[PDB]
């Protein structure tokens, strides 16, 4: 239940990111955002907390919800997945901020991470400590998450998730079969039995979905694209949810397909404040409206922004992807989009839990 709600929420956030991104390539981690927002529930109260709970569909402090999320991270990280996944969450708080009595023990209980103290007025040191934690937890893949100005003397709380995935295709592509397509673009190619389905959107737009599994039996990448190349991908991203993805998988049959997939690396950083506000959680970003009295009642607190930086590398042997989601200010500037013959949506999914570790869109220019 909790796992499924976490997914639906992160997909809604993805949809908001895609909407605000206006046809740029986007890679994004639903699990990453849900992990950090789950922590945020425990730092907030009043209407701030209620906004998050309402949007997420669950209350971290209730029933065995926090326990469910800890068991979810365990399952994702288990050796039987046959592909490395690590997820880590951290909370950095202003060192001299007086915390609510019992906060640190309770947070550790629910989340199994201890509050880390940091003096944000030592701006460069604070940035280092947090950036270093992110690097250490993404195997050095997510660098300098916090740019200059990401935090400052007024910062009181930063929550961060770091997620790392390295998967090997169940059947790799042969480098020999990779060819440049004409800017020159490397296209990988493999003919094998793949789970495949055709599908149509509510408006009768046709599209299909193929599943490229990673080794083992839990992880795969879904690739979805309209049959007609001219169709704007919003036709698909507008209708995405966990149910639709279950419907894809549930509908597939295994068949000998020629699979063409671009060899590509994508690295994006997206604002999450807009998406979170649009999804009904504006209060946390307001120094006057925010309620962080679950964390501290010494002081009015808020978070200025949130962002997530994600990198994915897809090649002949598999996929390496990393994200870090953090409540810090983004000094992101747009990157140079890459070239592709056709738009498609990809979803990296832990199928047993329906958890989406990464999803994204590659948009034809």
Curated annotation (Swiss-Prot):
PROSITE patterns: SERPIN. One of its GO terms (biological process) is regulation of cell population proliferation. Transmembrane segments: none annotated. The keyword Lipid biosynthesis does not apply. GO terms for cellular component: extracellular space; peptidase inhibitor complex; serine protease inhibitor complex. Induction: Expression in the liver oscillates in a circadian manner. Serine protease inhibitor. Inhibits TMPRSS7. Is a primary inhibitor of tissue-type plasminogen activator (PLAT) and urokinase-type plasminogen activator (PLAU). As PLAT inhibitor, it is required for fibrinolysis down-regulation and is responsible for the controlled degradation of blood clots. As PLAU inhibitor, it is involved in the regulation of cell adhesion and spreading. Acts as a regulator of cell migration, independently of its role as protease inhibitor. It is required for stimulation of keratinocyte migration during cutaneous injury repair. This is Plasminogen activator inhibitor 1. The gene is Serpine1.
């Amino acid at each position: 239940h909790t796992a499924h709600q976490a997914t639906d929420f992160g997909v809604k956030v993805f949809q908001q990111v895609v909407q605000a991104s206006k046809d740029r390539n986007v890679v994004f981690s639903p699990y990453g955002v849900s992990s950090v927002l789950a922590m945020l529930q425990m730092t907030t109260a009043g209407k701030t907390r209620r906004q998050i709970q309402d949007a997420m569909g669950f209350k971290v402090n209730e029933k065995g919800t926090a326990h469910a999320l800890r068991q979810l991270s365990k399952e994702l990280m288990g050796p039987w997945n046959k592909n490395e996944i690590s997820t880590a969450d951290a909370i950095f708080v202003q060192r001299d901020l007086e915390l609510v009595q019992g906060f640190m023990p309770h947070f550790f209980k629910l989340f199994q991470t201890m509050v880390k103290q940091v003096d944000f007025s030592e701006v460069e040191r604070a940035r280092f400590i947090i950036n270093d934690w992110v690097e250490r937890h993404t195997k050095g893949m997510i660098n300098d998450l916090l740019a200059k100005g990401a935090v400052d003397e007024l910062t009181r709380l930063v929550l961060v998730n770091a997620l790392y995935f390295s998967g090997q295709w169940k059947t790799p592509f042969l480098e020999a079969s990779t060819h440049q397509r004409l800017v020159s673009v490397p296209m990988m190619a493999q003919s094998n039995k793949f789970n495949y389905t055709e599908f149509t959107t509510p408006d009768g737009l046709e599209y299909d979905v193929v599943e490229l599994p990673y080794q083992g039996d839990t992880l795969s990448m879904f690739i979805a694209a309209p049959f007609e190349k001219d169709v704007h991908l919003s036709a698909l991203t507008n209708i995405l949810d966990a149910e639709l993805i279950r419907q894809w998988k549930g509908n597939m049959t295994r068949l000998p397909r020629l699979l063409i997939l671009p060899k590509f690396s994508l690295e994006t950083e997206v604002d999450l404040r807009g998406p979170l506000e649009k999804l009904g959680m504006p209060d946390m970003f307001s120094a006057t409206l925010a309620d962080f009295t679950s964390l501290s009642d010494q002081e009015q607190l808020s978070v200025a922004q949130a962002l997530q930086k994600v990198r994915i590398e897809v090649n002949e042997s598999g996929t390496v992807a990393s994200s870090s989601t953090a409540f810090v200010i983004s000094a992101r500037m747009a990157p140079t989009e890459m070239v592709i013959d056709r738009s498609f949506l990809f979803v990296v999914r832990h199928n047993p839990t329906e958890t989406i570790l990464f999803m994204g869109q590659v948009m034809e220019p």
